[PDB]
From Swiss-Prot, chains A, B:
GO terms for MF: 5-hydroxymethyl-dUMP N-hydrolase activity; identical protein binding; protein homodimerization activity
Induction notes from the record: Expression is induced by ETV1.
Summary of subunit composition and partner proteins: Monomer and homodimer.
Protein name in UniProt: 5-hydroxymethyl-dUMP N-hydrolase
Catalytic activity: 5-hydroxymethyl-dUMP + H2O = 5-hydroxymethyluracil + 2-deoxy-D-ribose 5-phosphate
Activity regulation, per record: Inhibited by AMP and GMP.
Subcellular compartments: Cytoplasm; Nucleus
Gene Ontology CC terms: cytoplasm; cytosol; extracellular exosome; nucleus
Primary location: cytoplasm
E.C. designation(s): 3.2.2.-
Residues of the full protein shown: 20 to 159 of 174
Amino acid sequence: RPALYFCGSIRGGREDRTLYERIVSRLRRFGTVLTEHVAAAELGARGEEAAGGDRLIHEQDLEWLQQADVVVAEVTQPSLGVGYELGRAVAFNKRILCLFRPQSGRVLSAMIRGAADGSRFQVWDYEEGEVEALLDRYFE
Amino acid sequence: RPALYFCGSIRGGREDRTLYERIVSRLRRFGTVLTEHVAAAELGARGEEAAGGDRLIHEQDLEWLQQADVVVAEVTQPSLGVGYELGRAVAFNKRILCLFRPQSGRVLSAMIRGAADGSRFQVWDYEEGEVEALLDRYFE
Ligand SMILES: O=C(O)c1ccc2c(c1)CN(Cc1nc(N3CCc4ccc(Br)cc4CC3)no1)CC2
Ligand SMILES: O=C(O)c1ccc2c(c1)CN(Cc1nc(N3CCc4ccc(Br)cc4CC3)no1)CC2
């Protein structure tokens, strides 16, 4: 099956976390979501105490990024980790889709919006209600 | 002169902005800070209206990142742009120094802390009072 790498802020708030779950749920229809092979707590979702070591989280993520056929990033919440994953993914020449919610009232980083080229790196603005449909449009 | 690339959150708060200025001021002693060749407003410091286009900001930053001998990043505020710049810099095999203030009460992203190798990628925790001394220690 196609290998998918999902990324979002490890400190995402309630609305962001509900959306990461809906996104990962829909991505399962199209391929293997590598990033769900370990518990969210082990990657840091419940704080430093439940997390694995920083070096292990970095190495595991770089291994998954290299195995992935497509990178899907939810870029609504500012995150060094998501940005770093996107930087490494661009340099690996990965097919990348960024999903951004303008209704958050945020302005997406010019470094992410400016990386878009309409083909291998796309940034799609969306509203919460249509995220599954947009994933279907991308992965059809 | 050695070419230095500085990066910090374009949405950094008051304390972060005072520190970026002190850092760039001290870096001038060691080399050319490429990132000050354009006004902070043009990179987005005063909002989208005064900023240049996203693609121009991305391309200008990638050109400066490739010309740089050392990348210095202040990673206290979560930022997709700073993370992305760090990802691209790692893949360009740049010498990188990240400066993080634990007194902010934040926990630095495991993707940045886990990228450290003690040599080409270092993460130094600091308190505001010693930032100039630590830059002297790094660049001596
Ligand atoms: O924000 C950071 O600085 C940061 C630091 C480390 C990591 C990353 C970011 C992202 N990496 C890739 C990745 N994202 C994800 N999802 C799904 C799991 C999940 C559940 C609940 C919450 Br609340 C947040 C999350 C995170 C998003 N699964 O894998 C993992 C390591
Ligand atoms: O946070 C982001 O998502 C993001 C988006 C775009 C850019 C970046 C980040 C960072 N890039 C490299 C860079 N940083 C900087 N400094 C100094 C200038 C300055 C003054 C005041 C404030 Br308040 C903030 C800043 C920014 C830090 N000079 O060049 C430029 C483009």
